[PDB]
Ligand SMILES: C#CCO[C@@H]1O[C@@H](C)[C@@H](O)[C@@H](O)[C@@H]1O
Ligand SMILES: C#CCO[C@@H]1O[C@@H](C)[C@@H](O)[C@@H](O)[C@@H]1O
Ligand SMILES: C#CCO[C@@H]1O[C@@H](C)[C@@H](O)[C@@H](O)[C@@H]1O
């Protein structure tokens with residue numbers, strides 16, 4: 001097991017609007033969209049993209065601006081659905097085959113080819129990619145081996161090499177990387193040690209370093225980073241303290257200051273932020289109240305403000321966002337959302 | 345002729361630092377680099393990349409983070425130099441051939457292939473591209489025809505299609521675009537009318553629209569935009585008033601509010617910005633003082649603040665930046681810079 005997961009995936013679209021994707025009580029993927037590219041825009045309300053899924057659905061934006069949603073099907077294959085043109089109609093659901101046992105994780109290579117990562121039937125890391133920029137057809141499936149016990153997360157280094165993070169059978173954070181951008185040649189697996197009790201969360205800092213966050217054995221929020229832009233040595237593990245009861249979420253403020261969010265022991269949303277600037281020391285933890293039943297999902301909107309989403313006690317998706325002074329009151333976006341994560 | 349040009353090219357690097365590139369009294373390309381990814385970082389001092397150039401040198405970042413600098417050579421061919429690895433050593437200068445009669449303009453396609461645009465010996469628009477993502481060899485040159493009378497400027501639409509802007513023989517703003525992302529198929533030329541007396545300056549908005557700024561026949565700053573995300577019809581020309589004596593520079597604040605900069609009749613730096621939000625009305629023009637002998641160059645740094653560069657009365661490069669309350673006083677980065685613009 002791992003800490004409680006995020007309930008939605010979110011994207012800031014090609015036209016600057018937030019769109020959130022989750023799973024309904026009918027096992028379809030539903031989505032909810034800002035009308036306008038601003039903090040506090042009205043929302044569409046929940047709308048179904050149909051299908052029947054058995055993982056968290058994960059939205060990604062192609063390099064031509066088209067949204068694409070990936071999810072495990074009822075046959076355990078990887079399935080996907082995409083906008084046929086930027087901000088336009090959706091394709092039918094289509095299978096990418098395989099047999100997967102985690103949520104999918106997606107990134108664009110430097111050549112615009114989406115690459116998708118998931119755990120396999122064998123508990124190894126597997127991957128598949130677009131054969132040309134922002135387009136099918138897709139490659140055959142292949143394995144990066146290893147044996148992993150969390151959902152994988154992928155990011156891109158500031159030199160263009162993809163890098164994947166996952167928990168190992170010893171509960172340490174492990175990782176593996178492309179040897180060159182767009183490459184099919186990957187490193188050996190390497191351990192970054194620690195004991196982690198959530199999915200890892202990875203972000204790129206303003207200064208080009210990968211930084212990984214995860215709940216520890218003591219239920220504190222911990223992090224570890226590349227000390228040099230796209231390069232080792234990594235730092236030691238460092239504690240940001242707290243006691244958290246979900247996976248964390250991390251986003252960059254307007255000024256690049258990292259900010260981490262998680263559910264607290266009182267089930268409120270809590271957060272801690274870098275102070276002064278993006279190189280800065282982290283603040284003490286502070287509560288944003290509420291009573292939540294998922295990990296939070298954080299994202300920076302087109303006004304440069306953080307917006308945080310979490311499921312509530314009524315199973316609706318609730319929302320709060322940064323204002324000048326403070327944070328806004330929690331508001332409900334309604335709906336009934338379930339946690340369909342393929343690893344819990 | 346066109347309004348006075350910018351003296352440097354600037355990039356916010358893969359690791360978050362500002363680096364500026366200009367032409368020294370020896371006609372070599374020189375550069376100056378922030379040590380750290382923060383407003384008010386100390387600078388390296390000017391350092392030479394050698395070469396002998398007869399255009400403004402134009403820096404662009406490959407999709408793998410490697411800087412690449414483009415410039416017209418003493419033989420009028422397009423020349424370039426690149427980092428051999430991200431943020432590391434530089435190649436030798438190499439020729440991409442052709443005969444060009446403007447500064448070069450560069451954008452990355454959605455497939456990661458850089459494409460460069462320049463006016464040719466025939467006065468038409470020409471282009472050349474990398475044949476694979478962030479790598480040579482380059483394609484053959486081809487023409488998009490037209491007859492142009494300014495430096496061209498390229499940008500990417502929110503659906504991934506490159507689009508190029510230039511002044512025509514009638515002094516109107518003309519443009520031309522890819523019919524699909526990464527394509528060798530382009531539109532016919534189309535006129536956006538108006539009378540322009542500077543190079544056009546293009547930026548993408550938070551909501552995915554191309555917006556173009558130019559000095560008008562009355563020496564006011566004018567602009568015009570796509571009405572629908574990545575699509576015509578375009579707006580009317582609208583005036584932002586002022587009386588300006590250089591090319592404008594435009595950048596996005598970290599909340600996406602556009603902000604334009606230009607030298608005034610008194611040779612000081614002046615600016616006007618969007619208020620409220622990125623969909624807000626523009627402020628009155630305000631002075632940032634200084635006495636400057638080039639157009640200003642504006643860029644957002646890794647603290648989310650705008651920084652503006654301009655040549656001074658002593659031919660050094662000077663710098664002011666946004667602060668909480670105000671703007672910083674002008675500071676000198678030293679050096680002696682010449683205006684090597686191919687079109688004056
Ligand atoms: C519109 C609407 C809201 O619908 C609710 O929320 C959706 C996300 C689904 O769970 C539906 O089954 C449920 O009824
Ligand atoms: C076409 C289509 C959609 O298919 C549904 O949704 C897919 C994601 C799979 O779960 C299929 O097994 C299921 O029938
Ligand atoms: C080298 C290597 C691969 O290691 C495997 O996969 C890693 C991710 C860990 O789970 C190890 O405990 C396991 O043996």
Ligand SMILES: C#CCO[C@@H]1O[C@@H](C)[C@@H](O)[C@@H](O)[C@@H]1O
Nearest residue numbers: 157177178179230231232234
């Ligand atoms: C190629 C290569 C090397 O990759 C880098 O250096 C490795 C030794 C690891 O520290 C990775 O996190 C990092 O991306």
Ligand SMILES: C#CCO[C@@H]1O[C@@H](C)[C@@H](O)[C@@H](O)[C@@H]1O
Nearest residue numbers: 241242243264265266270285
């Ligand atoms: C250290 C600290 C901050 O607070 C702790 O961690 C927070 C996230 C909450 O869980 C509190 O209930 C708990 O006391």
Ligand SMILES: C#CCO[C@@H]1O[C@@H](C)[C@@H](O)[C@@H](O)[C@@H]1O
Nearest residue numbers: 289290291312313314318330
């Ligand atoms: C404070 C507040 C807002 O409301 C609380 O937190 C929300 C996220 C919901 O769980 C409500 O049911 C709960 O009452």
Ligand SMILES: C#CCO[C@@H]1O[C@@H](C)[C@@H](O)[C@@H](O)[C@@H]1O
Nearest residue numbers: 368369370374390679680681
């Ligand atoms: C070091 C240094 C600064 O050098 C000055 O500024 C450079 C940009 C060149 O013009 C040199 O010729 C001049 O001497």
Ligand SMILES: C#CCO[C@@H]1O[C@@H](C)[C@@H](O)[C@@H](O)[C@@H]1O
Nearest residue numbers: 395396397417418419423437
């Ligand atoms: C190699 C090299 C450097 O060459 C100089 O700089 C290049 C950019 C060209 O102008 C050459 O013609 C000139 O000789």
Ligand SMILES: C#CCO[C@@H]1O[C@@H](C)[C@@H](O)[C@@H](O)[C@@H]1O
Nearest residue numbers: 490491492512513514518533
């Ligand atoms: C069609 C076409 C191209 O038109 C040419 O190129 C345009 C950019 C203008 O300069 C016209 O005045 C000129 O005739």
Ligand SMILES: C#CCO[C@@H]1O[C@@H](C)[C@@H](O)[C@@H](O)[C@@H]1O
Nearest residue numbers: 501507521523574575576577
């Ligand atoms: C394909 C296509 C259409 O291109 C768009 O629509 C055209 C009519 C122009 O407005 C361009 O500025 C824009 O890029």
Ligand SMILES: C#CCO[C@@H]1O[C@@H](C)[C@@H](O)[C@@H](O)[C@@H]1O
Nearest residue numbers: 633634635656657658662674
């Ligand atoms: C006001 C001010 C700061 O300085 C002025 O503007 C600078 C940009 C230089 O031109 C100086 O030589 C001049 O004195």
Ligand SMILES: [Cl-]
Nearest residue numbers: 045046334335
């Ligand atoms: Cl609804």
Ligand SMILES: [Cl-]
Nearest residue numbers: 050091092093
């Ligand atoms: Cl379907």
Ligand SMILES: [Cl-]
Nearest residue numbers: 153200201202
């Ligand atoms: Cl993540």
Ligand SMILES: [Cl-]
Nearest residue numbers: 280281282283
């Ligand atoms: Cl700290």
Ligand SMILES: [Cl-]
Nearest residue numbers: 016301302550
């Ligand atoms: Cl944005």
Ligand SMILES: [Cl-]
Nearest residue numbers: 371397398418
């Ligand atoms: Cl010369």
Ligand SMILES: [Cl-]
Nearest residue numbers: 480481482483
């Ligand atoms: Cl070549």
Ligand SMILES: [Cl-]
Nearest residue numbers: 441483484485
């Ligand atoms: Cl050629």
